[PDB]
Amino acid sequence: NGMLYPQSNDSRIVFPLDGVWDFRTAGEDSYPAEWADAPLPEPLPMAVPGSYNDQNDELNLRAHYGWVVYQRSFAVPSRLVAGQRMILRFDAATHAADVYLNGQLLGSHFGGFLPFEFDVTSALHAGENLLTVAVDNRIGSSTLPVGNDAGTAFMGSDNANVPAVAEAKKHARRQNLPNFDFFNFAGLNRHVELYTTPADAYIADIAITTERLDHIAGDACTAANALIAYDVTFGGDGRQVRISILDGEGTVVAGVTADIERTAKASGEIAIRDAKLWNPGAAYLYTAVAELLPSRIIDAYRQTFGIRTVEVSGTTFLINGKPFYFKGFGKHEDSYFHGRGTDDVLNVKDVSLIHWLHANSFRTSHYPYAESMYDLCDREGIVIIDEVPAVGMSWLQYANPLVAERHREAIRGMIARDKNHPCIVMWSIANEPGLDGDGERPRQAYDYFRPLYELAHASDPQNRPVTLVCCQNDYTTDITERTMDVVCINRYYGWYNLSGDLDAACHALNIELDFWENIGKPVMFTEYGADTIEGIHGTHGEMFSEEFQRDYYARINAEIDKRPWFIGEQLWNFADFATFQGIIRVEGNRKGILTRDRQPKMAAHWLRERWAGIPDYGYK
Amino acid sequence: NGMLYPQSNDSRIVFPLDGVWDFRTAGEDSYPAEWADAPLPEPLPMAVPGSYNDQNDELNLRAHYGWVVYQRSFAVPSRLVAGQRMILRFDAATHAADVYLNGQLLGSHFGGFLPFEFDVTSALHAGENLLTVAVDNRIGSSTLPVGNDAGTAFMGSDNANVPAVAEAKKHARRQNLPNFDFFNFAGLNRHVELYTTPADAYIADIAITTERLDHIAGDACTAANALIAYDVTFGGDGRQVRISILDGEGTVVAGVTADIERTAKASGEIAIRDAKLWNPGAAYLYTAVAELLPSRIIDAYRQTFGIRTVEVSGTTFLINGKPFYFKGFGKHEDSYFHGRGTDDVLNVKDVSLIHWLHANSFRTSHYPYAESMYDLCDREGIVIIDEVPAVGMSWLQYANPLVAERHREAIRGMIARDKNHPCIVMWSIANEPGLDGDGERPRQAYDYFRPLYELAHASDPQNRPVTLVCCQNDYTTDITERTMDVVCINRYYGWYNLSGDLDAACHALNIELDFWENIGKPVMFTEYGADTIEGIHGTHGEMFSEEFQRDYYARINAEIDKRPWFIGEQLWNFADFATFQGIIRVEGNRKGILTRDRQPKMAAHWLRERWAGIPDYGYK
């Protein structure tokens, strides 16, 4: 269950496998088995980590459907592997992968956005090893994120009644048709590494929680006492683990030795007096050092954490008991040459842009992001809503057992991966599924989602709030969104409807606001905005101009400011990003308040000025 | 019935009324009629001719619904009006006008793209005269071009099932919702002038026709003999008219003196040897000078004309008996500050661009253009397909008698204004009306359009072919298009359907071309294309890039080159132009091969190269 990010220390070494690999495209539903047995013939170079789609302009890899195959060699010293447990970790391979080492199948994985690993202690050998990783990009009616099996991509144009068109569709080259509004970037999107733990007994998982705060200071910077809980799981095979709590200067401030009981597990609580709390805008981090004992140490793992509480109370969202206000946007992992490939230079810049804007939060629309971005947000005091790739879903999926299982896997796997970040305050279990309509459809959606909501509460030792991000729908027949712990709505009044009329758009919004006023749940925007081509200007700004985007936020934000129970504004989007090509996507989605190159459109300046005058705590 | 453009000479003077008029916005369904009795109060300046929408950036005149009132003063010497018939001509007031001169209502007009005039002999007086013109911009289900009474504009986005949207629509500010893909520019779009004829008897109309050509040269530059026919109508009240035919040097090469018979009319024929023929790419113009005899001259008009025949024969389009191929585009009367207002600097520049491109034709999409433009294409050898504003129609309109009358007025009024131009080779009676479907719908559309097809044939003394420009539809249940003289199809395979997939698009195209091969009529494109933002580039061009627009035409044009019966390629559009705002219109329609400022995109260079190798005659 545990997927602690590989660490190097006195018991453990991490050997990164990143670099420029060999690569070949292969078939729509096969690849040659002998490519895992001997060097790939006539290989193309491919950097990892990185999407493969934008790394070759001689090929049209954006159009590729099916498999591709990655390969490299690596050698490691014998004295490093001797006696150790050897683990090969894939931070992400999108969407599915088969992995081979020295011609032997290690195993397969499905789920493009969460890590998997393999024990390679016995397949490794001395000298050069040959690592082949076949990667399947296919999406469809049973994958998460959801592909369309036939027809068009999401928000695609059609003339389906034209006989020529129905006929030509039967014979068109097969391609992935996203039922989601971002490009289907594929491949070894995050890092690959070999790493070492002791073999006889090792730390397999840690979980740290904030159980209780007594007498939080008026400014929320400290509490008189913090009660944290620890849970350490071990693998392998009278034993003990020492747990030391380090403050932000590394000083030991608490420490206990705990008995390991046999799914070997040490569990307990620790009191921290004068604890320093973690807050949006004022991060503070501790470390939990777990040392498995035999003076010598058998195994060790340093787990970062932050001391804070999260609680929904009536129509308030309380962090360390203070009424928080979300200022932010949905993001994407998306950039010009990487595609969805992790890039920590961009993560760092993006976090400073978040501060420059005076935002305080974002959502991982629409898949768990690379692990380092959460470590960055823990240290920079940015709040995250962590979301699974359950985007594109409708009634066809709810009745599909394989989708339900993949959905539960993504939820468990996300929470297992990310449970220790203080910056995560809330989980999202889907983006824009079909929840409304008539007949049994609202109930069928409810019955699909209610156990997933429960599953997110039960997998999280911190028991954070759980939401479901809702599309623009008939809010009167949707019975699912209103039961979430926070209502998170995507609304495009004045863009996809009442187009360009901000008066009518604000009047429509207030009518739906009047509906949510009585539900008695905290409500926030998780999407709203307007496609905007930088450099299109007008004195009376129309759709696609910079002015219209600034006018859109100014008018919409003035409405929600009148609602005490509206606790957050996460717009769509932080930055322009790539989508499948289509008549409404001008080189992708252009709702960024920043360009794809992260430059600020007029609305970013206006939003930065508004957010500089809105406090994290106490705005409502 | 005739609308000869105002001409000055020994018997007639034209007094222009263009310039900077006074102006006011008024109400949605009314304006103050006492404004005709005195200077408009607190007036704005407004240049005439021109759309008013983009002449004031303090107000949002693009958003204006209803009436505006223009006004100016003018004075002329009494010795000029003395004894003369005084005609006040509006070349175009879009869409409807009430016209007042010195407080007297002169009358009203509907039809925003065709000239209309009033006899003011008895409403003029010495000194300053006060001219007041109310202009009505409203469109709806009984106008041509067609507006939508509720709902969205054409190609508009909606979320109609959201209750807040349905409720906000009831109270939204009224705006015109075009059922056509171009901005509803209104005002005194074309020139205003007062002109003189003799009162007692005057030339009222002139029509010249090329009746027959004997022994046309191999290169079609001359014929051994040409038979032309004249028809001169007079107003007012043993008389005669002298008709002289001047060649391009002004030499009288033929001439006749004809008897006038009462409705007063002179008609006859005139043989012209070694006649110099008007062809695409090689214009030649004659002048028919009509002189009303009493040695003195009572009245005179100089009517330009060109000698050429047009004939559809099987699957060929014959100009002077040679098989012609259309190269060109739909156009728009559209530019940055003028809106739809006429601009002769622009007309001259566009005609030079048509030459630069090696194009030979365009269509007047989707309304008759200004009269100067056709004179310019007469002298520059550019063929025109002339089209009425019947755009946006479906079954709702076919049962409306007010609309059917407007449609007959537009066809008769277009052809009466334009009959003499040799550059006009073909009439279009409608753009993209609903024609297909099931039940009685196809037959209803056929019963509506067939009398209009006959009316165009019978209004035109030259009896040129008539078409109807068809939208992308189910060509197997459309039964009207196939009965036109030439089949003119708007097709967006690979743009609005099969999006981005040029192989699938070309397959679909060929399936439809197989249908049309069996029909046996000459066929041509009148629209096809791809929105394109200049500067957007990719090595594998995706939609909106310049490379995609170029690849779109390369692939499509290689398919129609395989079809001998496919007689023309008029793409959409010559240049980017403004539309009602919406999610598919990035600052208007971007399918121009030129930008709105007439700069070549990549595709314009590619097309220029293809067209330079394609002859006007004999390519197929």
Token look-up 């990549």 returns B602
Q: What is the DSSP letter of A367?
A: S
Map residue B319 onto helix, strand or coil.
strand
A542 vs B473, B475, B581: nearest CB: B581
Q: How far apart are the first and last CA of chain A?
A: 40
Q: Is the dihedral of CA A146, A147, A151, A157 positive or negative?
A: positive
On the 0-12 / 13-18 / 19+ scale of CB atoms within 10 A, B10 is exposed
Map residue B611 onto helix, strand or coil.
helix
A584 vs B498, B533, B583: nearest CB: B583
Question: With an 8 Å Cβ cutoff, are A161 and B545 in contact?
Answer: no
Question: With an 8 Å Cβ cutoff, are B168 and A545 in contact?
Answer: no
Quick one: tokens of A350? 């993006």
Q: What is the DSSP string of A198-261?
A: ESSEEEEEEEEEEEEEEEE-TTSSEEEEEEEEEEEEEEE---EEEEEEE-TT--EEEEEEEE-B
CB neighbourhood size of B479 (10 A)? 14
Measured distance CA(A586)–CA(B500) in Å, rounded: 13
Question: With an 8 Å Cβ cutoff, are B499 and A582 in contact?
Answer: yes
Residues in B closer than 8 angstroms to A539, CB to CB, are 57
Measured distance CA(B347)–CA(B350) in Å, rounded: 5
Measured distance CA(B581)–CA(A530) in Å, rounded: 13
Measured distance CA(B347)–CA(A198) in Å, rounded: 82
Residues in A closer than 8 angstroms to B531, CB to CB, are 583
Dihedral of the alpha carbons of A425, A428, A432, A437, in degrees to the nearest 10: -110
Residues in A closer than 8 angstroms to B442, CB to CB, are none
Say what angle helices A401-418 and A371-380 make with each other, to 10 degrees: 40
Say what angle helices B441-459 and B401-418 make with each other, to 10 degrees: 30
**Computed over its alpha carbons, how large is the radius of gyration of chain A?**
25
Measured distance CA(A234)–CA(A266) in Å, rounded: 8
Measured distance CA(B96)–CA(B113) in Å, rounded: 10
Cis peptide preceding A49, ω within 30 of 0:
yes
- Integer CA distances (angstroms), B12 to B6, B294, B357, in order: 9, 16, 40
How far off is chain A from B88, nearest CA to CA, in Å?
36
Half-sphere exposure of B149 (CA within 13 A, CB side): 6
How far off is chain A from B89, nearest CA to CA, in Å?
34
Measure the CA angle with vertex B395, ends B389 and B397; round to 5°.
Answer: 45
Measured distance CA(B358)–CA(B335) in Å, rounded: 22
* A390-401 burial: b if 16+ Cβ within 10 Å, else e: bbbbebebbebe
Question: With an 8 Å Cβ cutoff, are A173 and B504 in contact?
Answer: yes
Q: What is the DSSP string of A49-111?
A: SS-STTS-TTTTTTS--SEEEEEEEE---HHHHTTEEEEEEES--BSEEEEEETTEEEEEEE-
How far off is chain B from A583, nearest CA to CA, in Å?
6
**Computed over its alpha carbons, how large is the radius of gyration of chain B?**
25
Q: Is the dihedral of CA B387, B388, B392, B394 positive or negative?
A: negative
Q: What is the enclosing helix (H) or strand (E) of B506?
A: helix B502-519
B168 vs A158, A475, A511: nearest CB: A511
Residues in B closer than 8 angstroms to A549, CB to CB, are none
Residue type, B130: L
Residues of B with a catalytic annotation lie at 432, 527
Question: With an 8 Å Cβ cutoff, are A498 and B173 in contact?
Answer: no
Measured distance CA(B392)–CA(B145) in Å, rounded: 6
CB neighbourhood size of A258 (10 A)? 17
| Residue A328 β-bridge partners | A361, A570
- Integer CA distances (angstroms), A291 to A251, A271, A561, B553, in order: 16, 19, 50, 68
How far off is chain B from A390, nearest CA to CA, in Å?
23
The residue ranges of DSSP E strands in A237-321, in sequence order, are: 240-246, 252-259, 264-276, 286-292, 299-305, 310-313, 316-319
A164 vs B57, B508, B587: nearest CB: B508
Residues of A with a catalytic annotation lie at 432, 527
Report the length, in residues, of chain B.
Answer: 620
Asked if A154 and A434 touch (Cβ cutoff 8 Å), the reply is no
Check chain A for breaks (C–N over 2.5 Å) and list the residue before each, or none: 237, 262, 294
> What resolution in angstroms does the PDB record give?
2.2
- Integer CA distances (angstroms), A24 to A40, A53, A70, A173, B182, in order: 8, 12, 7, 20, 48
Half-sphere exposure of A496 (CA within 13 A, CB side): 16
Say what angle helices A371-380 and A344-357 make with each other, to 10 degrees: 40
Contacts of residues A588-592 at CB distance under 8 Å and 24 or more positions apart, as own/partner, are A588/A183, A589/A181, A589/A182, A589/A531, A590/A531, A590/A532, A590/A533, A590/A544, A591/A529, A591/A530, A591/A531, A591/A532, A592/A532
Measured distance CA(A206)–CA(A230) in Å, rounded: 7
The residue ranges of DSSP E strands in B457-503, in sequence order, are: 466-470, 487-490
- Of B462, B402, B396, B457, which Cα lies nearest the Cα of B429? B457
B495 vs A163, A498, A583: nearest CB: A583
Measured distance CA(B73)–CA(B517) in Å, rounded: 60
Report the length, in residues, of chain A.
Answer: 620
Residue of B nearest to A532 (CA): B586
Measured distance CA(B318)–CA(B303) in Å, rounded: 25
Question: With an 8 Å Cβ cutoff, are B509 and A159 in contact?
Answer: no
Q: How far is CA B129 from the centre of its chain?
A: 32
Q: Which residues contact B157 (CB under 8 A, 6 or more apart)?
A: A495, A496, A497, A499, B582, B583, B584
Residues in B closer than 8 angstroms to A583, CB to CB, are 495-496, 499, 531, 543, 584
Residue type, B379: R
Residue of B nearest to A537 (CA): B587
- Of A436, A433, A424, which Cα lies nearest the Cα of A466? A424
Question: With an 8 Å Cβ cutoff, are B500 and A533 in contact?
Answer: no
Question: With an 8 Å Cβ cutoff, are B165 and A475 in contact?
Answer: no
Phi and psi at B587, nearest 5°, equal 60, 45
Question: With an 8 Å Cβ cutoff, are A581 and B168 in contact?
Answer: no
Question: With an 8 Å Cβ cutoff, are A587 and B540 in contact?
Answer: no
Token look-up 């494109």 returns B525
How far off is chain B from A40, nearest CA to CA, in Å?
26
How far off is chain A from B65, nearest CA to CA, in Å?
14
- Of A166, A93, A222, A432, which Cα lies nearest the Cα of B475? A166
Quick one: tokens of A134? 């076949």
Experimental method: X-ray
Question: With an 8 Å Cβ cutoff, are A475 and B162 in contact?
Answer: yes
- A-B Cβ pairs (cutoff 8 Å, strict): 180
Asked if B389 and B123 touch (Cβ cutoff 8 Å), the reply is no
A586 vs B173, B473, B544: nearest CB: B544
